[PDB]
Design a protein around this nucleic acid. Structure first.
Ligand SMILES: [Mg+2]
Length: 579
DNA sequence: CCTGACTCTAA
DNA sequence: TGAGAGTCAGGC
């Protein structure tokens, strides 16, 4: 039973200039969510404060907002945002244990203080799940149990700062935490708090039109099946397709017959039901995920969505977005793309501005591999897909057919995402053998990329990990494995992580640089979203001309590589038009 | 109610 | 390739 004071007023000794601070928000989505308790651990002792006491106290609030009063926390964005919703600024967070643990080993899955603490053999803190329960049973416990938990977390943070900072420094990652991930966390908190405005009326009428289309196609499907069934059930659809209608089984899943879109495309010539099922799937995906899904998470009082960015989840250093996920809004097919008409500026006479890197991953690869051919291509700002086709097929530019370019683009995509030869075969509907031939032909044209791929797998084997441009790390113990599939995956991750992770590093740096530049230039423009290689802002219409120059330049100059970086940009009345 | 399987969307 | 989400179905 750890010693602490259950204070019922704030005292001067709670406001020391260095502390471990816990501002506890138990709800998974922390927007406008309750703070259930506060703990402070510092040189003078350990303290628990009730939030209705602490957050109405002027000296405590001034302390929270004083940048010169340093705090160590876990998941400081959660606390910062919950506080933003109460009109209180949190400053001076000089160490975030969540981001520290994430940098030290993203594969650990650290999502509470106890998981971080276990990495340094500190176990005097319970997992959050043990205290709050899980799922339906999730609940805030009685004050004594809650208070001891928060104080134990704060005490762990206080104890663990030094050993985490020492390891970060041995890894050359201390500047990564302090100059990149922590400042980024503040920027993301502002982006989430600002939110993106949604034209719910547009979304609703789209939903009405979709529902009408769904009803028509659903009926057509039952007619063609001679029967009603749940079209959304791959199992029931499987019985209709493969048993009642006797279509060939081209592919199986673990548990049954495949009904994936690519399989269905190949069955379309056998039966009219198939094209109708494909149409149903496309419409139903839009309706259920995009329209019903978005509408459910728009806040009714401001008509905004406030995503939460997970900065401490992916193995590559990429951001993730939830509730809603705004990184997978349709764009490829026009029907789906219209969804983006519903994302609008939050003020009148404002516009949406979007800026994206052009081929950042292959440009990073050019730089890291020093491949002379690939570097020359980007120095000439060539269409990289056409140029790759010309090299692999050994033809002139005017002999590149559309299919040749599509296949080259597929090879390039494979390189950017670290897909296997099986994956490539699958993506191009060709044999594994032919895919191996493509890949081999690629390495003959880009021998420096071949050399990089060989060298980085050996490096991963020797060191145990690979690193990105800004010193992010991914451990790959699977690389040795005697299981071929397990090992091959590890090798692909060794190849791909420095590409994808360096691209992540760059855009994170761009974000930091951009936020600083916007303030220096006294613009009202604000950052709303990041979608891997693009940044989405809204600004007064009078700022567009300046942003057209400023944003690409900041992004382009974020790092200096052996090849240029190139940023394209667009703006308009909705995210759709920012194209 | 919880969890795994299947499908689909983006980069 | 990574992630997030919706839906179903089996086990509870
Ligand atoms: Mg792009």
């Amino acid at each position: 039973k750890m010693a602490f004071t259950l204070a019922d007023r704030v005292t001067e000794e709670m406001l020391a200039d260095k502390a471990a601070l816990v501002v506890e928000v138990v709800e998974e989505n922390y927007h406008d969510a309750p703070i259930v308790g506060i703990a402070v651990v510092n040189e003078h002792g350990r303290f628990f404060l009730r939030p209705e006491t602490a957050l109405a106290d002027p000296q405590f609030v001034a302390w929270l907002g004083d940048e010169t009063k340093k705090k160590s926390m876990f998941d400081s964005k959660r606390a910062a945002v919950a506080l933003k919703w109460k009109g209180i600024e949190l400053c001076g967070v000089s160490f975030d244990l969540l981001l520290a643990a994430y940098l030290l080993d993203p594969a650990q899955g650290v999502d509470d203080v106890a998981a971080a603490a276990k990495m340094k053999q500190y176990e005097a803190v319970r997992p959050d799940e043990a205290v709050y329960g899980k799922g339906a049973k999730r609940a805030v416990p009685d004050e004594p149990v809650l208070a001891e938990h928060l104080v134990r977390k704060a005490a762990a943070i206080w104890a663990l700062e030094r050993p985490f900072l020492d390891e970060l420094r041995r890894n050359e990652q201390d500047r990564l935490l302090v100059e990149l991930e922590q400042p980024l966390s503040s920027i993301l908190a502002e982006m989430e708090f600002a939110g993106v405005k949604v034209d719910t009326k547009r979304l609703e009428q789209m939903g009405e039109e979709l529902a009408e289309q769904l009803r028509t196609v659903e009926q057509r499907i039952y007619e063609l099946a001679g029967q009603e069934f749940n079209i959304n059930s791959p199992k029931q659809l499987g019985v209709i397709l493969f048993e009642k209608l006797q279509l060939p089984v081209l592919k199986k899943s673990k548990t049954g017959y495949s009904t994936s879109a690519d399989v269905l495309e190949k069955l379309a010539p056998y039966h009219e039901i198939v094209e109708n099922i494909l149409h149903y799937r496309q419409l139903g995906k839009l309706q259920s995920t995009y329209i019903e899904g978005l509408l459910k998470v728009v806040r009714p009082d401001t008509k905004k969505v406030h995503t939460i960015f997970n900065q401490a989840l992916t193995q590559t250093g990429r951001l993730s977005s939830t509730e809603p996920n705004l990184q997978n809004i349709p764009i490829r097919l026009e029907e789906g793309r219209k969804i983006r008409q519903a994302f609008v500026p939050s003020e009148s006479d404002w516009l949406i501005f979007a800026a994206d890197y052009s081929q950042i991953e292959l440009r990073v690869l050019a730089h890291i591999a020093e491949d002379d051919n690939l570097m020359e291509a980007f120095r000439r700002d060539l269409d990289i897909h056409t140029k790759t086709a010309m090299d692999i097929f050994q033809v002139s530019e005017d002999e590149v057919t559309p299919n040749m370019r599509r296949q080259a683009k597929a090879v390039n995509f494979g390189i950017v995402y670290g897909i296997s030869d099986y994956g490539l075969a699958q993506n191009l509907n060709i044999s594994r053998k032919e895919a191996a031939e493509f890949i081999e032909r690629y390495f003959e044209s880009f021998p420096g990329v071949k050399r990089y791929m060989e060298n980085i797998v050996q490096e991963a084997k020797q060191k145990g990990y690979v690193t990105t441009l800004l010193h992010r790390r991914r451990y790959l113990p699977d690389i040795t494995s005697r299981n071929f599939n397990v090992r091959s995956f590890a090798e692909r991750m060794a190849m791909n992580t420095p590409i994808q992770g360096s691209a992540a590093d760059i855009i994170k740096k761009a974000m930091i640089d951009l936020n600083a530049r916007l303030k220096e230039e006294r613009l009202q423009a604000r950052l709303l979203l990041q979608v891997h290689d693009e940044l989405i802002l809204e600004a007064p219409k009078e700022e567009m001309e300046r942003l057209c120059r400023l944003v690409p330049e900041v992004m382009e100059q974020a790092v200096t590589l052996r090849v240029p970086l190139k940023v394209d940009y667009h703006y308009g009345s909705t995210w759709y038009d920012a194209k």
